Paper text:
Superimposition of the [name]*07:02 molecule onto the structure of [name]*07:02 bound to a nonameric RFL9 peptide48 illustrated little movement in the [name]-I molecule (root-mean-squared deviation (r.m.s.d.) of 0.2 Å), despite presenting distinct peptides. Given the anchored restraints at the peptide extremities, the central residues, encompassing P4-Gly→P11-Ser of the NY-[name]-160–72 peptide, bulged extensively out of the peptide-binding groove. Here, the solvent accessible surface area of the NY-[name]-160–72 peptide was double that of the RFL9 peptide (620 Å2 compared to 290 Å2), thereby providing an extended surface for TCR-mediated recognition. Taken together, these structures indicated that the NY-[name]-160–72 peptide was highly malleable prior to engagement by two cognate TCRs.
Human leukocyte antigen ([name])-I molecules are of central importance in the presentation of antigenic peptides, enabling CD8+ T cells to eliminate cancerous and virally infected cells. However, [name]-I molecules can present extended peptides (>10 amino acids), whereby the N- and C-termini are similarly constrained within the [name]-I molecule, forcing the central region of the peptide to bulge from the Ag-binding cleft. NY-[name]-1 is an immunogenic cancer-testis antigen that is spontaneously expressed on a range of melanomas and other cancers including myelomas. To identify the principles underpinning extended peptide recognition, here we investigated TCR binding of an immunodominant NY-[name]-1 13-amino-acid peptide (APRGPHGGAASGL) derived from positions 60–72 of the cancer-testis antigen, NY-[name]-1.
Residue numbers in the entry:
A (entry chain B): 1 to 99
B (entry chain A): 1 to 275
C (entry chain C): 1 to 13
Write the structure that this text describes.
């Protein structure tokens, strides 16, 4: 029995165009633990993205935080792209600073 | 108030790609403070919180030995579990371990935990009495009989009531500026037009620690559990957490909706409205 | 600190 990841894409602080910040992709609720996560800037993969140490919740499902420093603008689109055994194709979630 | 220490072990087999990987992380409450990874270049317990860095070389050495030994033990366990479920050697499997202690304000043991899951499902757990086990299935009953024969629960209990509590007390003392500090949520309500006759009200909670929070919408003082969209509490990356809750409201009816925030950093629960 | 294997051939599953 496997569990598909929940995905949230969001900033560390309320986004302000021109101000430095951190872009997060939080993946959680998944099993097994192998998972691939990309952060995308205008569709392309951001390099040297760091992540938290693998850990898990009380229901044994895993969670990871992927993060990178970003300076948001009104132009630039950001997203998180997630692959997992439970997914037939990569799942992309767009960054919406209202969410 | 209450505090917890928890270790989280994950062992994952990967036939054809080496021996199983063992990774451990340690937490006090919602604060990770150590890690160990058998896939590291030079596997060693490493500090992940400022207040643990003061521990001497003896600490890191001892704990590192414990993790390496545990990785080996887990590899044997994974072999056995394979057998217990009549599984081949070809598949990948996961063994997770979660244990630790909860203490109150006076530092006395409130509760101990020591449990296990195999391939994501509960396998065996030490009962609250710290003297007996609950097995989830006939495979775990084999583990249970083995541990009863070995009086294993007594060792687990000895750790939980002894070293676990004392180390937690020590960590709470050394990291008190963070571990004993609740950061209240910063809160606001946003308004997002959906259509001519409908809009979203979203109640935000930002920058709070620990993660436990209650965030609800009411319409005319009545809870809107079914009509509220509530995201999972998420880490900001600066130790703090975030959460929001949203409701769809008919145009003009916005002032009938209130957002309610409970958090331990809040002396009294907040009530917010749009603007 | 993690629980040490003082037992110690029986702590496995």
């Amino acid at each position: 029995i496997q569990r598909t990841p929940k995905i949230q894409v969001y900033s560390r602080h309320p986004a302000e165009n021109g101000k430095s910040n951190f872009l997060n992709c939080y993946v959680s609720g998944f099993h097994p633990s192998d998972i691939e996560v990309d952060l995308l800037k205008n569709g392309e993969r951001i390099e040297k993205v760091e992540h938290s140490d693998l850990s898990f919740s009380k229901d044994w499902s895993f969670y990871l935080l992927y993060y990178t420093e970003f300076t948001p603008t009104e132009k630039d689109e950001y997203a998180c792209r997630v692959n997992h055994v439970t997914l037939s194709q990569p799942k992309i979630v767009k960054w919406d600073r209202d969410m | 108030g209450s505090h917890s220490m928890r270790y989280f072990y994950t062992s994952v087999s990967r036939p054809g790609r080496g021996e199983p990987r063992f990774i451990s992380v340690g937490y006090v409450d919602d604060t990770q403070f150590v890690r160990f990874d058998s896939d590291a270049a030079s596997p060693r317990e490493e500090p992940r919180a400022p207040w643990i860095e003061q521990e001497g070389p003896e600490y890191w050495d001892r704990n590192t030995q414990i993790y390496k030994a545990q990785a080996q033990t887990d590899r044997e366990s994974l072999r056995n579990l394979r057998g217990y479920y009549n599984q081949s050697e070809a598949g990948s499997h996961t063994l997770q371990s979660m244990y630790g202690c909860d203490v109150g304000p006076d530092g006395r043991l409130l509760r101990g935990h020591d449990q296990y899951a195999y391939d994501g499902k509960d396998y065996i757990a030490l009962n609250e009495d710290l003297r007996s086990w609950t097995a989830a299935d006939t495979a775990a009953q084999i583990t249970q009989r083995k541990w009863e024969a070995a009086r294993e629960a007594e060792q687990r209990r000895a750790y939980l009531e002894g070293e676990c509590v004392e180390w937690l007390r020590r960590y709470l003392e050394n990291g008190k500026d963070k571990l004993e500090r609740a950061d209240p949520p910063k809160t606001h309500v946003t308004h997002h037009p959906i259509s001519d006759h409908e809009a979203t009200l979203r109640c935000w909670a930002l920058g709070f620690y620990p993660a436990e929070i209650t965030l609800t919408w009411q319409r005319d003082g009545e809870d809107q559990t079914q009509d509220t969209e509530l995201v999972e509490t998420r880490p900001a990356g600066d130790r703090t957490f975030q959460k929001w809750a949203a409701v769809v409201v008919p145009s003009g009816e916005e002032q009938r909706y209130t957002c309610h925030v409970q958090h331990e950093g809040l002396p009294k629960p907040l009530t917010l409205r749009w603007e | 600190a993690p629980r040490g294997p003082h037992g110690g051939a029986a702590s496995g599953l």
